[PDB]
Design a protein around this ligand. Sequence first.
Ligand SMILES: CC(C)CN(C[C@@H](O)[C@H](Cc1ccccc1)NC(=O)O[C@H]1CO[C@H]2OC[C@H](Cl)[C@H]21)S(=O)(=O)c1ccc(N)cc1
Ligand SMILES: [Cl-]
Ligand SMILES: [Cl-]
Ligand SMILES: [Cl-]
Lengths: 99, 99
Amino acid sequence: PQITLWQRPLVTIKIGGQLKEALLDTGADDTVLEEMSLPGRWKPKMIGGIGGFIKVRQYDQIPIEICGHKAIGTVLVGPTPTNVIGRNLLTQIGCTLNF
Amino acid sequence: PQITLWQRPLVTIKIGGQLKEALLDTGADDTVLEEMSLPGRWKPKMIGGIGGFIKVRQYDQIPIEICGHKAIGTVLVGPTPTNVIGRNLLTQIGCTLNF
Ligand SMILES: CC(C)CN(C[C@@H](O)[C@H](Cc1ccccc1)NC(=O)O[C@H]1CO[C@H]2OC[C@H](Cl)[C@H]21)S(=O)(=O)c1ccc(N)cc1
Ligand SMILES: [Cl-]
Ligand SMILES: [Cl-]
Ligand SMILES: [Cl-]
């Protein structure tokens, strides 16, 4: 698809059996989602943004589906005010900026 | 241009006759730059990030070049970790996401 930027670029993602709304976010290195359960190993991480840092749990090798596009990658879970899909997963669905 | 997302989408901007580096950030509503001088009067704004809110100065109708593309619009100035070009200016330069 071609996604306009007049509005926030929200999409539905399928992850861990759940459907969530998330922001396609080229300024995020990493995908960060609100509190949820995921399976397997994780390690603590601090990530930083406008306003400072938050602590998250880093899960690796998590399957996700975005707009029909399957991918696998790292998902950070913690107290983000909004769900963001970061570059680590945007690359995998072949997402580019164009102008 | 078409910009892939394997690295941060950093571009050169020009504002007030000076070159800076900034991040093309589809997850930002608003453009926010690190401390700098701009002309005219400013209004107050709070903007909300991953780690909470910060106070910024809002300047309106500021000329800014982004990757050589000419825009004129609102620039927020404050203690952001990184210069970000948000959707308010990405729309002026005809930017879309595509996959
Ligand atoms: C997270 C969005 C809801 C909004 N944010 C833009 C977002 O792309 C934000 C931009 C940014 C970049 C580097 C450092 C600080 C902030 N990205 C972001 O927080 O990414 C997080 C998760 O991935 C990491 O890679 C970048 C930072 Cl260090 C971490 S923002 O808080 O920075 C923001 C909010 C409003 C405006 N007008 C501008 C920016
Ligand atoms: Cl990854
Ligand atoms: Cl590619
Ligand atoms: Cl504007």
